[PDB]
Amino acid sequence: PGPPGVVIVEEITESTATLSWSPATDNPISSYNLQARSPFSLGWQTVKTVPEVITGDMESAMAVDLNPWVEYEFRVVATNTGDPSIPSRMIRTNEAVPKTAPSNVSGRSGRRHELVIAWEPVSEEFQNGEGFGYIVAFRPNGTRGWKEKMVTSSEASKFIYRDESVPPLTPFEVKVGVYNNKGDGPFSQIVVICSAEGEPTAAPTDVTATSVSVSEIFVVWKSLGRPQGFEISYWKDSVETVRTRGNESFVMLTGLEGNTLYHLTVRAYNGAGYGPPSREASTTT
Amino acid sequence: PQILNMHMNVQNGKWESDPSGTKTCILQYCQEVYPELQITNVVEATIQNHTHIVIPYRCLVGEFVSDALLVPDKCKFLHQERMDVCETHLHWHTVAKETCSEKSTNLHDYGMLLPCGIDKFRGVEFVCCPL
Numbered sequence A: 001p002g003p004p005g006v007v008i009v010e011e012i013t014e015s016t017a018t019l020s021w022s023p024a025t026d027n028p029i030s031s032y033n034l035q036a037r038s039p040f041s042l043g044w045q046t047v048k049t050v051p052e053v054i055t056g057d058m059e060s061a062m063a064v065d066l067n068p069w070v071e072y073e074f075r076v077v078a079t080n081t082g083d084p085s086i087p088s089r090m091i092r093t094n095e096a097v098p099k100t101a102p103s104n105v106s107g108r109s110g111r112r113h114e115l116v117i118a119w120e121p122v123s124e125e126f127q128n129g130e131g132f133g134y135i136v137a138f139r140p141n142g143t144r145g146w147k148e149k150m151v152t153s154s155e156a157s158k159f160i161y162r163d164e165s166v167p168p169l170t171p172f173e174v175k176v177g178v179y180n181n182k183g184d185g186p187f188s189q190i191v192v193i194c195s196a197e198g199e200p201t202a203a204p205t206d207v208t209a210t211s212v213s214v215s216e217i218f219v220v221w222k223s224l225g226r227p228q229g230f231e232i233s234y235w236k237d238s239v240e241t242v243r244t245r246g247n248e249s250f251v252m253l254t255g256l257e258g259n260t261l262y263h264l265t266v267r268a269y270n271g272a273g274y275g276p277p278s279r280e281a282s283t284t285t
Numbered sequence B: 001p002q003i004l005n006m007h008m009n010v011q012n013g014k015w016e017s018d019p020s021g022t023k024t025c026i027l028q029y030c031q032e033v034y035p036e037l038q039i040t041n042v043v044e045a046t047i048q049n050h051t052h053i054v055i056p057y058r059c060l061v062g063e064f065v066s067d068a069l070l071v072p073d074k075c076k077f078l079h080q081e082r083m084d085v086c087e088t089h090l091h092w093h094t095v096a097k098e099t100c101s102e103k104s105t106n107l108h109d110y111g112m113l114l115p116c117g118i119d120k121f122r123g124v125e126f127v128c129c130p131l
Helices: B027-033 B089-102
Strands: A007-012 A017-021 A031-036 A060-063 A074-079 A114-118 A133-140 A146-151 A158-162 A171-180 A183-187 A191-194 A208-211 A217-220 A229-236 A240-243 A250-253 A261-269 A281-284 B039-044 B057-061 B069-071 B076-081 B106-117 B120-129
Touching: A007 A074, A017 A074, A031 A060, A114 A133, A114 A171, A133 A158, A133 A183, A146 A158, A146 B076, A208 A281, A217 A261, A229 A250, A240 A250, B027 B039, B027 B057, B039 B089, B069 B076, B069 B106, B069 B120, B076 B089, B076 B106, B089 B106, B089 B120
Parallel strands: none
Antiparallel strands: A007 A017, A017 A060, A031 A074, A114 A158, A133 A146, A133 A171, A146 B069, A171 A183, A171 A191, A208 A217, A217 A250, A229 A240, A229 A261, A261 A281, B039 B057, B076 B120, B106 B120
16 A cells, blocks of 8 residues: 555644544555654554554544653554655653652762762653652651752762761661652652761771792781772882782782882772771782 | 851851951852852851841852752652742742642741852742641
């Protein structure tokens, strides 16, 4: 069969677009099929219509189950299956309240009095309107009331709250909701994230370095900021830094020069930063 | 940082008089009082040294960060915003208070949103609490 002429979108709602088209050429047509495309669609995709089956005598239909505030583009296909029609003009569905809360509400590393809350941003496909934003609600675990913060950036993925009265590693119940111009949306499920844990504050003590071979030296050492690992700097008399195999209390320097005096310092680190250096140890291969 | 005229000593926590001793009865004064800070805007919130009850102007530093409002239990967190308007702080305070009155509640706390000028904003956040 021939292709339809072009799609004319007559009425637009939040999830519904009433559209018509000029009929295709019968070379007896069984049905017309409707497809739409959005910046979030993986190409052209079929749409649900009213009526469920668009018979051959019908030149119009009502596309349903569309997403609010999403740009769309329609085309018709005839089947007795022929070529699709010319794509319609770019329309956009009407605004609606948001129905999708952000996922992966979690925490991040921060400073000693920061509560770093993070979340996966919501794409425009599920913002459902202009003026989209987030509502970050948090409270100490077990308390009643909430502290709420409005994040007006639609692309924002985290928020940092600074409170000098909140001690480090304090658990907080956290919700992250959504809103737009037409009204508020739902909140995410309550998650519990701890605050702060700043940079490691204590330096390693009893740093003992001992020569093992002509090119190897074994080092061993022993708070407020939890250590995620230790970085060890060693110089001869050429600065070189090395790290541990996780949160361990030792390293083995390799590839050193024979019968050579080396100096050494150790310091811990985590996601927030580094700690203070240790006392300078030294041995000779 | 907030503001003869008197200002808040951010290092001690007390109120000091005008540095030159001449300025009496806003954004430019915030910047001259705190030259080490980047004062970008001002917004409305008892001082002796003879007592006087005044509502000080907060010298907003750097980019605007909306205030974190406290929502006690059994209260509601509400907010209004219009990208096609730009009103004053007194307007949004009255809007927030009248909105709680329409719902037969009281205005417990409020804050400004989306600045659009010197002490003028495009939105408001507030908390209505039951009677």
